[PDB]
């Protein structure tokens, strides 16, 4: 579903919290025009899509980076 940049962050956060015991979160980046970019998040059951333009790329970048680093932990 096409969603704005704000609610996409909390949807992705809830997706991260959902697959803690089982599941994988897929994040895809691709250049979509019809400059704009397309980002989709899908764990297999729920699909979320968001388009980011150059007017809010800077605002979206820091939030996306903080969210991505917050909910990823592997092997030390």
């Amino acid at each position: 579903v096409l969603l704005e940049s704000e609610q996409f962050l909390t949807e992705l956060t809830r997706l991260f919290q959902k697959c803690r015991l089982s599941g994988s979160v897929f994040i895809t980046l691709k250049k979509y025009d019809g400059n704009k970019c397309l980002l989709r998040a899908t764990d297999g059951k729920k699909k979320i899509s968001t388009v980011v333009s150059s007017k809010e790329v800077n605002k979206f970048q820091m939030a996306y980076s903080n969210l991505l680093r917050a909910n990823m932990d592997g092997l030390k």
Binding site: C19, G23, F26, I27, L29, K31, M72, L75
Partner: protein
């Protein structure tokens, strides 16, 4: 294909992106149950994969993803 190294996978991905921007794409998959993170970039002619999350490399993975986003938005 599966270049399990650093400073070589990223350069190859950048070269693939510069080869064709309309078809280049990257998919990020994280599995919390196994604690594994995998990076795959597809150019529709070649595909590269990268297992062994190496949690120390989270910053250099997210920075690469954001850098690709910046080029996709420029």
């Amino acid at each position: 294909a599966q270049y399990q190294t650093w400073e070589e996978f990223s350069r190859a991905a950048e070269k693939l992106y510069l080869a064709d921007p309309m078809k280049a794409r990257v998919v990020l998959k994280y599995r919390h149950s196994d604690g594994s993170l995998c990076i795959k970039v597809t150019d529709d002619l070649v595909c590269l994969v990268y297992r062994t999350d190496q949690a120390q490399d989270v910053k250099k993975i997210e920075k690469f993803h954001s850098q690709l986003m910046r080029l996709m938005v420029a």
